[PDB]
Design an enzyme around this catalytic site. Structure first.
Site, short mmCIF file in Angstrom:
data_model
loop_
_atom_site.label_atom_id
_atom_site.label_comp_id
_atom_site.label_asym_id
_atom_site.label_seq_id
_atom_site.Cartn_x
_atom_site.Cartn_y
_atom_site.Cartn_z
N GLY A 1 -9.77 -4.87 11.20
CA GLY A 1 -9.34 -4.53 9.83
C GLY A 1 -10.16 -3.40 9.24
O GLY A 1 -9.71 -2.80 8.25
N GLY B 1 -10.69 -0.37 10.27
CA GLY B 1 -9.89 0.88 10.28
C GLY B 1 -10.44 1.90 11.25
O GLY B 1 -10.47 3.09 10.89
N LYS B 2 -10.86 1.47 12.43
CA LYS B 2 -11.42 2.41 13.45
C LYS B 2 -10.27 3.23 14.06
O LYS B 2 -10.48 4.43 14.31
CB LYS B 2 -12.17 1.64 14.53
CG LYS B 2 -13.64 1.37 14.23
CD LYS B 2 -13.99 -0.10 14.25
CE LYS B 2 -12.81 -0.98 14.58
NZ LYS B 2 -13.00 -2.37 14.10
N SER B 3 -9.12 2.61 14.29
CA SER B 3 -7.97 3.34 14.88
C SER B 3 -7.41 4.35 13.87
O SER B 3 -7.14 5.49 14.28
CB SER B 3 -6.90 2.38 15.34
OG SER B 3 -7.25 1.81 16.59
N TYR B 4 -7.25 3.93 12.61
CA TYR B 4 -6.76 4.85 11.56
C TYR B 4 -7.55 6.15 11.64
O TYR B 4 -6.94 7.23 11.54
CB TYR B 4 -6.92 4.21 10.18
CG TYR B 4 -6.54 5.08 9.02
CD1 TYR B 4 -5.28 5.02 8.46
CD2 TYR B 4 -7.45 5.98 8.47
CE1 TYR B 4 -4.92 5.82 7.39
CE2 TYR B 4 -7.10 6.79 7.40
CZ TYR B 4 -5.83 6.71 6.86
OH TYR B 4 -5.49 7.50 5.80
N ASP C 1 -13.03 4.53 20.92
CA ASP C 1 -12.49 3.56 19.98
C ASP C 1 -12.80 2.16 20.49
O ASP C 1 -12.37 1.80 21.59
CB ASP C 1 -10.99 3.75 19.80
CG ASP C 1 -10.31 2.51 19.25
OD1 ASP C 1 -10.84 1.91 18.30
OD2 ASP C 1 -9.23 2.15 19.77
N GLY D 1 -12.28 -4.55 17.55
CA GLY D 1 -12.96 -5.17 16.40
C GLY D 1 -13.37 -6.60 16.68
O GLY D 1 -12.57 -7.35 17.27
N1 LIG Z 1 -8.29 5.25 4.83
C1 LIG Z 1 -7.23 4.48 5.06
N2 LIG Z 1 -6.08 4.73 4.38
C2 LIG Z 1 -5.02 3.95 4.62
N3 LIG Z 1 -4.89 2.93 5.46
C3 LIG Z 1 -6.04 2.72 6.11
C4 LIG Z 1 -7.22 3.42 5.98
N4 LIG Z 1 -8.19 2.90 6.83
C5 LIG Z 1 -7.59 1.91 7.45
N5 LIG Z 1 -6.28 1.75 7.05
C6 LIG Z 1 -5.32 0.77 7.52
O1 LIG Z 1 -6.03 -0.38 7.93
C7 LIG Z 1 -5.24 -1.08 8.92
C8 LIG Z 1 -6.12 -1.46 10.08
O2 LIG Z 1 -6.76 -0.27 10.61
P1 LIG Z 1 -7.21 -0.28 12.15
O3 LIG Z 1 -7.73 1.06 12.53
O4 LIG Z 1 -6.11 -0.89 12.97
O5 LIG Z 1 -8.44 -1.30 12.11
P2 LIG Z 1 -9.60 -1.64 13.17
O6 LIG Z 1 -10.72 -2.17 12.32
O7 LIG Z 1 -9.81 -0.35 13.92
N6 LIG Z 1 -8.99 -2.80 14.14
P3 LIG Z 1 -8.10 -2.52 15.49
O8 LIG Z 1 -6.69 -2.15 15.14
O9 LIG Z 1 -8.04 -3.76 16.34
O10 LIG Z 1 -8.70 -1.40 16.29
C9 LIG Z 1 -4.05 -0.16 9.24
O11 LIG Z 1 -2.91 -0.55 8.50
C10 LIG Z 1 -4.55 1.20 8.76
O12 LIG Z 1 -3.52 2.11 8.45
#
Ligand SMILES: Nc1ncnc2c1ncn2[C@@H]1O[C@H](COP(=O)(O)OP(=O)(O)NP(=O)(O)O)[C@@H](O)[C@H]1O
Ligand SMILES: CC(=O)O[C@H]1C(=O)[C@@]2(C)[C@H]([C@H](OC(=O)c3ccccc3)[C@]3(O)C[C@H](OC(=O)[C@H](O)[C@@H](NC(=O)c4ccccc4)c4ccccc4)C(C)=C1C3(C)C)[C@]1(OC(C)=O)CO[C@@H]1C[C@@H]2O
Ligand SMILES: Nc1nc2c(ncn2[C@@H]2O[C@H](COP(=O)(O)OP(=O)(O)O)[C@@H](O)[C@H]2O)c(=O)[nH]1
Lengths: 139, 432, 382
Positions: free
Chosen positions: C97, C99-102, C245, C248
Site C-alpha cells: 500500500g 506505493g512503490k510500484s506507482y 521494485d 511489500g
Molecule cells: N502519489 C500517488 N498518487 C496516486 N496514487 C498513488 C500514489 N502513490 C501510490 N498510489 C496508489 O497506491 C496504490 C498502491 O500502490 P502500489 O505501488 O501498488 O503499492 P506498494 O506499496 O508498492 N505495494 P505492491 O503493489 O505490492 O508493490 C495504487 O492504487 C497506486 O496508484
C-alpha cells in the site's frame, strides 16, 4: 509457588479458602495476628484486605500420593506487586536474543511479521509500569 | 502420523544403513523374515514410522538403496537381513563413478536419478503424513557425494516443506583412503550448505579413538563404527516412536538447534560406554551420563569443542528418571563451564526424555551439539584444496566430464564464507 | 558520500476511507514527523531525509510532488552519474500500500510516468542529441524477477525452467542465460517493458487489488564509444543502471492471505527480513570503521542468505552509488509499519557507497606516464 519474593512489594488483596474443621473465631484471630506484623505490607487504599471462605469437606488423599492426611487445609490467593519482578527477568532474556534477530526466521517463515515482536514487548512494558504505580503511596 | 523415508547411497551409506536396519528391527521386534515376534505391546503402536504393512502380517522397511556398482547390492542381499527389503527398491547401474564427483553428479548419476526419483515418489505417496527424509553417504568418495547431492537437490525442489537430514562421514585429517578427497568434499559441502536442513558430521578417526580408548577393543572393524553410528541414528528420533514426558519431534530439534539458516552442522554423541568387564564398577545414573556425554573424548566429530563455544546443544534421555535431576545437571554444566557457552543466548540446552530405554540399557542419552569449533574441519579441507588447485593436480579427470574451474572457485568461496560466519561468533567479548 | 533517500507520502485509498482514518505524517523541507495516535501528548518523532514528497493533492501546487519532480531530483542525477561512468542503483521500499510500484512503473495511460519510463526517455533523448561522427552509444536491457528464491526471466518467452545463479570470480554474482536484448529505438524498449509487466506474476489481496508477488529488477547496460580515429579508442566507458521494485511486507491476518498466498507472503517476509539485517549490518560496519579508529575490524556482512541480497551484492556495497525510495501510508491504523519504514530508511542513510570508475590499467598507466613525460618536458623546456 513462583520464584518471587513477596517482601519487595505490597499486598493488595487476599482470599483465604479453608477446608475441614475450622471455626470463624480462629480465622478472625489469625487475621488479626497477620495484620499486627510489620513484614507484611498492605497498600493504604485497601483498609480491609482479606476475604474468607470456609468449607466442611476436608481434602482427600490419593493412593500412592505423598501428602499426608490432614484435618485442616488452607489455600491462599494473594494479589501482590512482587510479580512484576519475575516478568522483568523474562524481559531481559528476550532482549538479549532480539538484538541479533536469533531464531526469527523460523517465526517469519510461518506467517508472522517481524514487527509483531516489538509491539508485544512494548505492550508488556506497559503492563509492568501499571503494577508500579498502583502501589505508589497516595499523596 | 509421522513417516520417515530413508535413502542410502554408496558403499559407506549402504553398510551403515544395513547395520542400522538390523538395530531398529530388534528395538521393535521384527524377525529377519518379516514376521513380528515380540513381547511388549508398545512395539507395534508406532511401527508405521519406518515399516509398511504387507498382507501376510509382514513388515517391510521404507528404505531405498542406491549405487552404481552391483557389488554392494549383492553383498547386502547375501546377508542376514537381505530378504527383509523390497526387491524393487534395489536401484543400481554398472560402470560406477570411480571416485569421481563429476561422473556421479553429471554423467552417470544423471541416468539413474530418474528411476531413483520414481521409487521415491511411489514410496512417499503412500505415506499418510510425511515428516521428512534422511540420507547416509560419505563425502570423500565418488558415487556417494555426487548422487546424494543430486538427490537432495531434486527432493528439495519437489518437497520444499518437509525436513531433510544427513549423516555424512567427512574426510579425516590424517587417516586417508583416497587421494582426491578434498575436491569431492568441497564440491559436496558447497551444496549441503544450501539444500539440507540438518547435518551430523561423523569422522572415522573419532570413532577409532572411541573404540580404542573407551571401548578398549583390540581389532575394531567397520562393523563397530556402523554400530556406534546406528546407535546415534536410532536415538535421535526416539520420541516419534515411544511415549514420554517431554516429546521432541525432528522439527522441534531443528527449531531449537539452528539459530540462523546456514549453521546446521552438528556433532553427535552417545552415552554411556563401559567397555565391558568394567560395567560392575561404574554406577549408572543421570549425573554419570551427563559427565560422560559432555566429555571431549566421546565426540564423534574429531574436533575439540574446547577450542570454540557451544552455539547450543540438545540432550535426549531414554529411561525412567526424575526431571529435577536432569534440569539441575544441565544447569550445573552450563554454570560450571561458563566460558565455553555463548553469552547472548540465556539458556542453550534443549531437553527431552523418553520412557522406553534400549533393549538392555537401564538408561541412555543422545547428544547433538552445535559449536563453532567445527570450523576447524572445514579449514583443513580448504587448505588441502588450495594445495591441489594452485597447480591443477588432478583436474583434467573432472574437466573431461563437463565442468570448469569456475565451479571449483565458487565452491571454495562458499566454504570459506561458511568458515568466516562460524568464526564471527567464536571469540569471546561480542556480548550485547 | 552516503546513500540518497527520497521518502514519499501516499494519498488515501478506499480501504482507508470505508474504515475511518486520519492523516498522521507531517513534513517540512528535509524533516519528516510522525505522532503516535496510541497516546497523544506523549512523544512526537522526527527524522531527517534528503528528499521528501507530498502527494495528497494534485490540482494545487501546495507542496505537491509530481512524479516528474521526483525524477528530476533523483533520476536525473543518477543518469548523469551513469554518463560519468559510475554504476548506479535505485531501489524502492515500504509495505503493501506504500506505493512503490506507482513510483517505479506508474500508469501507462497517465502522463505521470514512473521513474523507469522517464529515465529511459531522457537516456534516449540524450543519445539522439549527442550522437556524432566521433561519438556513438550502445544500449541493452534485461529484466528479471525473484518469485520464491527462483530467478525468472520476463523478456524471454514462456520457459518453464528457472535460471541458475553463478558467481564470476572477478565480476561477482550474476545469472546465467539471462536473455540480454539490445535496443535501438524507444519503441523497442517500450514494447519490451510492456511485455515484461504483462508477464509478471501478480495476485489480488485485501490491501491492494493488484499487488506484486515477486521482487523485480530492471537493468540497463550502456556503452560509450569515442571514435576519434586519430587519437581515441572505442568502448571507453561501460555503465550499469539498476532499478529495483521490492514486494511489500505482508501482515498475513490483515491481508486475508490463505493457502498459496500465505506461503508467498511468508517467503516475501523472509527475504525482507534478510534485507533488513544486511542493511543494518552494513550500516553499522561502515559507520564504525569510519569514525572509531580505522582498524578495519573484520566483521564481514553476510549476503549469501537470500538470492535478493546475493544478486544485489554490488549495489548495496562496492562500485555502485544508490538511492532508497521509501513509500508511506498516512493512515493512523498503519502506525507500526510506518515506524519500521522510517527507522530502516534512517539506517540506510548511514550507509556509505564507494563507486569508482575503472578502465584497463595498461591504458591508465600509459596515460599517467604520458602526463609525467609532459610535465618533465615542460620543466626542461622552460
Ligand atoms: N502519489 C500517488 N498518487 C496516486 N496514487 C498513488 C500514489 N502513490 C501510490 N498510489 C496508489 O497506491 C496504490 C498502491 O500502490 P502500489 O505501488 O501498488 O503499492 P506498494 O506499496 O508498492 N505495494 P505492491 O503493489 O505490492 O508493490 C495504487 O492504487 C497506486 O496508484
Ligand atoms: C551386556 C550389556 O548390557 O552391556 C552393554 C555395554 O557394556 C555397553 C558398553 C554397550 C555395548 O556396545 C559396544 O560394545 C559397542 C561396540 C561398537 C559400537 C558401539 C557400541 C554393547 O555391545 C551394546 C548393548 O546395547 C544394546 O544392546 C542397546 O539396546 C542398543 N543395541 C544396538 O545398538 C543394537 C545393535 C544391533 C542390533 C540391535 C541393536 C540399542 C539401542 C537403541 C535401540 C535398540 C538397541 C549394550 C547395552 C551393551 C553391550 C552388549 C556390551 C554400549 O553400546 C550400546 C549401544 O549400548 C557402548 O556404549 C554403550 C554402553 C554400554 O554399557
Ligand atoms: N564409517 C564407515 N566408513 C566407510 C565404510 N566403508 C567405507 N568407508 C569410508 O568411505 C570412504 C570411501 O567412500 P566410498 O564408499 O568409496 O564412496 P562411494 O565410492 O561413492 O560409494 C573411505 O574414506 C572410507 O573410510 C564403512 O563401512 N563405515
Amino acid at each position: 509457588m513462583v520464584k518471587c519474593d513477596p517482601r519487595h512489594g505490597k499486598y493488595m488483596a487476599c482470599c483465604l479458602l479453608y477446608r475441614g474443621d475450622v471455626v470463624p473465631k480462629d480465622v478472625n484471630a489469625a487475621i488479626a495476628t497477620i495484620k499486627t506484623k510489620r513484614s507484611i505490607q498492605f497498600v493504604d487504599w485497601c483498609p480491609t484486605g482479606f476475604k474468607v471462605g470456609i468449607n466442611y469437606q476436608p481434602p482427600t488423599v490419593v493412593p500412592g500420593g505423598d501428602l499426608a492426611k490432614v484435618q485442616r487445609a488452607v489455600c491462599m490467593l494473594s494479589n501482590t506487586t512482587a510479580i512484576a519482578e519475575a516478568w522483568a527477568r523474562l524481559d531481559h532474556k528476550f532482549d538479549l536474543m532480539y538484538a541479533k534477530r536469533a531464531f526469527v526466521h523460523w517465526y517469519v517463515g510461518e506467517g508472522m511479521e517481524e514487527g509483531e515482536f516489538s509491539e508485544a514487548r512494548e505492550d508488556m512494558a506497559a503492563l509492568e509500569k501499571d503494577y508500579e504505580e498502583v502501589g505508589v503511596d497516595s499523596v | 502420523m509421522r513417516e520417515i523415508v530413508h535413502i542410502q547411497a554408496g558403499q559407506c551409506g549402504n553398510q551403515i544403513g544395513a547395520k542400522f536396519w538390523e538395530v531398529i528391527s530388534d528395538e521393535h521386534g521384527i524377525d529377519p523374515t518379516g514376521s513380528y515376534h515380540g513381547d511388549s505391546d508398545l512395539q507395534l503402536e508406532r511401527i508405521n514410522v519406518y515399516y509398511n504393512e504387507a498382507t501376510g502380517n509382514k513388515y517391510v522397511p521404507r528404505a531405498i538403496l542406491v549405487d552404481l556398482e552391483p557389488g554392494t547390492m549383492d553383498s547386502v542381499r547375501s546377508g542376514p537381513f537381505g530378504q527383509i527389503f523390497r526387491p524393487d527398491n534395489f536401484v543400481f547401474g554398472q560402470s560406477g563413478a570411480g571416485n569421481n564427483w563429476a561422473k556421479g553428479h553429471y554423467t552417470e548419476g544423471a541416468e539413474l536419478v530418474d528411476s531413483v526419483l520414481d521409487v521415491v515418489r511411489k514410496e512417499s505417496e503412500s505415506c499418510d503424513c510425511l515428516q521428512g527424509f534422511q540420507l547416509t553417504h560419505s563425502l570423500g568418495g565418488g558415487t556417494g557425494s555426487g548422487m546424494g547431492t543430486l538427490l537432495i537437490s531434486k527432493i528439495r525442489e519437489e518437497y520444499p516443506d518437509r525436513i531433510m537430514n544427513t549423516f555424512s562421514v567427512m574426510p579425516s585429517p590424517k587417516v586417508s583412503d583416497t587421494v582426491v578427497e578434498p575436491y569431492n568434499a568441497t564440491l559436496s559441502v558447497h551444496q549441503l550448505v544450501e539444500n539440507t536442513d540438518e547435518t551430523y558430521c561423523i569422522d572415522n578417526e573419532a570413532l577409532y579413538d572411541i573404540c580404542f580408548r573407551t571401548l578398549k577393543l583390540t581389532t575394531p572393524t567397520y562393523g563397530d563404527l556402523n554400530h556406534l553410528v546406528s546407535a546415534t541414528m536410532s536415538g535421535v528420533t526416539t520420541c516419534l516412536r515411544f511415549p514420554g514426558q517431554l516429546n521432541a519431534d525432528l522439527r522441534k530439534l531443528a527449531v531449537n538447534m539452528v539459530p540462523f539458516p546456514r549453521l546446521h552442522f552438528f556433532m553427535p554423541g552417545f552415552a554411556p560406554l563401559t567397555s565391558r568387564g568394567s560395567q560392575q564398577y561404574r554406577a549408572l545414573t543421570v549425573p554419570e551420563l551427563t559427565q560422560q556425554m559432555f566429555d571431549s573424548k566421546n565426540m564423534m566429530a574429531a574436533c575439540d569443542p574446547r577450542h570454540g563455544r557451544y552455539l547450543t546443544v540438545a540432550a535426549i534421555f531414554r529411561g525412567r528418571m526424575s526431571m529435577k535431576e536432569v534440569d539441575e545437571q544441565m544447569l550445573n554444566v552450563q554454570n560450571k563451564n561458563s566460558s565455553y557457552f555463548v553469552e547472548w543466548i540465556p539458556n542453550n540446552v534443549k531437553t527431552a526424555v523418553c520412557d522406553i530405554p534400549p533393549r538392555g540399557l537401564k538408561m541412555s542419552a543422545t547428544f547433538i551439539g552445535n559449536s563453532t569449533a567445527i570450523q576447524e574441519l572445514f579449514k583443513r579441507i580448504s587448505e588441502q584444496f588450495t594445495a591441489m588447485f594452485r597447480r591443477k593436480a588432478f583436474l583434467h579427470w573432472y574437466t573431461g566430464e563437463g565442468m570448469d574451474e569456475m565451479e571449483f572457485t565458487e565452491a571454495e568461496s562458499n566454504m570459506n564464507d561458511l568458515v568466516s560466519e562460524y568464526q564471527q561468533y567464536q571469540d569471546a567479548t561480542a556480548d550485547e | 558520500a552516503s546513500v540518497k533517500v527520497a521518502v514519499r507520502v501516499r494519498p488515501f485509498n478506499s480501504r482507508e476511507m470505508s474504515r475511518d482514518s486520519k492523516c498522521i505524517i507531517q513534513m517540512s523541507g528535509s524533516t519528516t514527523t510522525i505522532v503516535n495516535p496510541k497516546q497523544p501528548k506523549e512523544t512526537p518523532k522526527s527524522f531527517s531525509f534528503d528528499y521528501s514528497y507530498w502527494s495528497h493533492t494534485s490540482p494545487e501546487d501546495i507542496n505537491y510532488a509530481s512524479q516528474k519532480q521526483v525524477y528530476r531530483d533523483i533520476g536525473e542525477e543518477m543518469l548523469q552519474h551513469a554518463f560519468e561512468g559510475y554504476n548506479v542503483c535505485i531501489f524502492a521500499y515500504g509495505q503493501t500500500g506504500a506505493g512503490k510500484s506507482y513510483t517505479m512503473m506508474g500508469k501507462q495511460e497517465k502522463d505521470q510516468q514512473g521513474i523507469i519510463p522517464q529515465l529511459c526517455e531522457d537516456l534516449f533523448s540524450r543519445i539522439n542529441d549527442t550522437t556524432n561522427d566521433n561519438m556513438s552509444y550502445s544500449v541493452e536491457v534485461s529484466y528479471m524477477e525473484i518469485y520464491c528464491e527462483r530467478v525468472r526471466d520476463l523478456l524471454n518467452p514462456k520457459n518453464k525452467g528457472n535460471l541458475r545463479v553463478r558467481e564470476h570470480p572477478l565480476l561477482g554474482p550474476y545469472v546465467e542465460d539471462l536473455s540480454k536484448l539490445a535496443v535501438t529505438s524507444y519503441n523497442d524498449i517500450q514494447d519490451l517493458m510492456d511485455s515484461g509487466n504483462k508477464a509478471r506474476t501478480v495476485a489480488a489481496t485485501n490491501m491492494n487489488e493488484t499487488s506484486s508477488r515477486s521482487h523485480a529488477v530492471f537493468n540497463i547496460i550502456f556503452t560509450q564509444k569515442r571514435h576519434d580515429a586519430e587519437t581515441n579508442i572505442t568502448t571507453e566507458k561501460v555503465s550499469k543502471i539498476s532499478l529495483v521494485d521490492l514486494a511489500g511486507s505482508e501482515r498475513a491476518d490483515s491481508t486475508g492471505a490463505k493457502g498459496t498466498r500465505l506461503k508467498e507472503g511468508a517467503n516475501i517476509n523472509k527475504s525482507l527480513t534478510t534485507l533488513g539485517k544486511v542493511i543494518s549490518a552494513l550500516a553499522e560496519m561502515d559507520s564504525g570503521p569510519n569514525k572509531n579508529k580505522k582498524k578495519k575490524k573484520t566483521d564481514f556482512i553476510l549476503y549469501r542468505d537470500s538470492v535478493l541480497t546475493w544478486l544485489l551484492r554490488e549495489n548495496l556495497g562496492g562500485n555502485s552509488r544508490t538511492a532508497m525510495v521509501a513509500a508511506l501510508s498516512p493512515a493512523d491504523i498503519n502506525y507500526d509499519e510506518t515506524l519500521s519504514t522510517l527507522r530502516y530508511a534512517d539506517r540506510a542513510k548511514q550507509i556509505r557507497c564507494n563507486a569508482v570508475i575503472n578502465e584497463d590499467p595498461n591504458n591508465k598507466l600509459i596515460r599517467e606516464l604520458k602526463d609525467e613525460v609532459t610535465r618533465l618536458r615542460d620543466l626542461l623546456y622552460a
